[PDB]
């Protein structure tokens, strides 16, 4: 019948998918664009061609970029990433719990995984070698305000106080460019929003809560995150007993169902995830 290249061909159209747009989600607000793929004919045959078999494992992708992308769109929270996209995204908002930060680094070290660390200005200032120890451990950090208010109440120059001040101190004591801002509490309004983006940060919230700060049982927290995980999804989570107990079990358990799991910047990006097959842009 059909050579290799010729079966390589016949299941392209099968693997394909088109590229998917940044949009602002009635509900679930802004979500990032989403990379599409189609077979890599060379890549593909080159994987097969010594084994003489077509097998849909050794399919290779050239990925394909959407139109509309995240930083399109106007000024609106972000809760989740893209809902095709098979993976997880990590948050650990921080304005205390020091004796718990060691073991989360060494946890995400042992799977390979990233998450964003969202420091409160004033931890930073009286904690300047843990907001270290967390870059130094290859993590990215956020800006979570500088004293934990209630910035849905507060004025608009109070708000830009908060975020300036927590960039500030931040970038001096990471060297880092802060990109994203979750607000104390998940509390916000429009003009947080629009502040946050005058600093050029987006403005993080989640879709799955640990409520690890009522110092739930390991198992608990554990069993609440995989009943509400979901592809995109963005966990909240603190330096706290309860997480520092589930986070080795939660990222295994996350990688068997098939996801990826990694910090705020990768989710958001559009590039795809490999998982059983090899994508390239």
Do not use: C
């Not at 970038?171 to 509490?185: H, I, M």
């Not at 940060?201 to 069993?223: A, Y």
Request: aromatic content about 8%; hydrophobic content about 35%.
């Amino acid at each position: 019948q059909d050579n290799l290249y010729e079966e390589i061909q016949k299941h392209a159209k099968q693997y394909e998918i088109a590229p998917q747009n940044a949009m602002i989600d009635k509900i679930w607000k802004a979500t990032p664009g989403y990379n599409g793929r189609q077979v890599d004919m060379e890549a593909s045959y080159n994987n097969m061609k010594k084994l003489k078999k077509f097998d849909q494992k050794h399919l290779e992708f050239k990925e394909v970029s959407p139109s509309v992308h995240l930083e399109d769109l106007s000024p609106a929270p972000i809760y989740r990433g893209h809902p095709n996209k098979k993976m997880v995204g990590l948050t650990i908002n921080v304005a205390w719990g020091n004796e718990y930060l060691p073991r989360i680094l060494e946890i995400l070290k042992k799977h390979d995984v990233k998450a964003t660390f969202f420091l409160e200005g004033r931890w930073v200032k009286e904690n300047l070698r843990f907001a270290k120890m967390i870059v130094d451990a290859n993590q990215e950090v956020g800006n979570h305000s500088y004293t934990h208010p209630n910035m849905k109440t507060l004025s608009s120059d109070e708000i830009r106080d908060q975020l300036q001040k927590t960039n500030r101190m931040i970038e001096a004591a990471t060297n880092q460019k802060v990109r994203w801002f979750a607000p104390p509490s998940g509390s916000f309004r429009d003009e947080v929003v629009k502040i946050a983006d005058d600093f050029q940060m987006g403005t993080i919230m989640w879709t799955v809560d640990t409520i690890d700060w009522k110092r739930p049982e390991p198992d608990v927290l554990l069993q609440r995150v995989m009943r509400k995980i979901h592809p995109g999804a963005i966990v909240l989570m603190h330096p706290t007993s309860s997480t520092t107990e589930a986070l080795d079990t939660m990222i295994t358990k996350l990688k068997e169902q098939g996801y990826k799991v990694g910090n705020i910047t990768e989710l958001l990006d559009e590039k795809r995830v490999d998982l059983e097959h090899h994508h390239h842009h």
